[PDB]
Amino acid sequence: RTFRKFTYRGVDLDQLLDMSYEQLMQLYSARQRRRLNRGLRRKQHSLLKRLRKAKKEAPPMEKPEVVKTHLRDMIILPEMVGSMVGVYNGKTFNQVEIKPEMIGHYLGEFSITYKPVKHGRPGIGATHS
RNA sequence: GUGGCGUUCAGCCACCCGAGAUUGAGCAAUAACAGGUCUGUGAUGCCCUUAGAUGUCCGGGGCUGCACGCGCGCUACACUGAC
């Protein structure tokens, strides 16, 4: 909290916003670079359009409206930061804050698909001889 | 084939010559099991369902989740070794 620098790969968020796709390919790691170099299809662009619209329609100095999606394989782009995304579990839409320091990840790893297990008592034949 | 045993039958043992003196499979009876499979089938009876479908397609998830118990395995514990 002492310093306010983001510095993703040595570059902070402003020139990391205005920089195009073809050099933040070089900025990312191998899997995200291959996803970006390969085609980024229609529904991903529709999600980005909805995120931009909900961002610019937000009144100043509060959070934008939550945007739901099934696309839990979207790369979290720098364009997406500070947004309000509901990511599907199969069952529910989970509220996720797109923080600046999650820009190399998928949306799927912020909405957990299962309930973590706490064990009951081993039932009957659970312990053999 | 030769020798020996055998009721001198059916055969067995040893040996010579030989590539070889018993290569490995496949197929495979009568009678059966409430064995498994309706999730192989445009094999199938009966029951259920049939539009807010248990038909079908699309999106996402699960089948892989982890205090524990069991089974088939893989890699090892090195100097008959590793590099």
Which tokens sit at A76? 């979290």
CA dihedral A9, A7, A17, A4 (to 10 degrees): 170
Is any atom of nucleic acid chain B found less than 7 Å from the CB of residue A126? yes
Nearest DNA or RNA nucleotide to A70 (CA to C1'): B60
How far is it, in rounded angstroms, from Cα A96 to Cα A68?
Answer: 10
**Given in angstroms, what resolution was this structure solved at?**
2.9
Nearest DNA or RNA nucleotide to A87 (CA to C1'): B60
Q: A76 and A94 in contact (C-beta within 8 Å)?
A: no
**Phi then psi for A82, rounded to 5 degrees?**
70, 20
Task: Give strand B nucleotides closer than 7 A to any protein Cβ.
Answer: 59-62, 65-70
| A100 Cβ contact partners less than 8 Å away, ≥ 6 residues apart | A6, A13, A81, A82
Which tokens sit at A81? 């930061």
Assign 3-class secondary structure to A27-96.
HCCHHHHHHHHCCCCHHHHHHHHHHHHHHHCCCCCCCCCCEEECCCCCECCHHHCCCEEEEECCCCEEEE
Q: A80 and A98 in contact (C-beta within 8 Å)?
A: yes
- Give the pairing of strands A67-69 and A93-97: unpaired
Q: A27 and A8 in contact (C-beta within 8 Å)?
A: yes
| CA A109 vs CA A9, A23, A66, A84, A119: distances in Å | 21, 25, 18, 15, 24
CA dihedral A92, A93, A97, A103 (to 10 degrees): 100
How far is it, in rounded angstroms, from Cα A42 to Cα A44?
Answer: 5
- Protein chain A, residues 95-114, with a C-beta closer than 7 Å to any atom of nucleic acid strand B: 108, 113-114
Is any atom of nucleic acid chain B found less than 7 Å from the CB of residue A44? no
The integer distance in angstroms from the CA atom of A36 to the C1' atom of B26 is 59
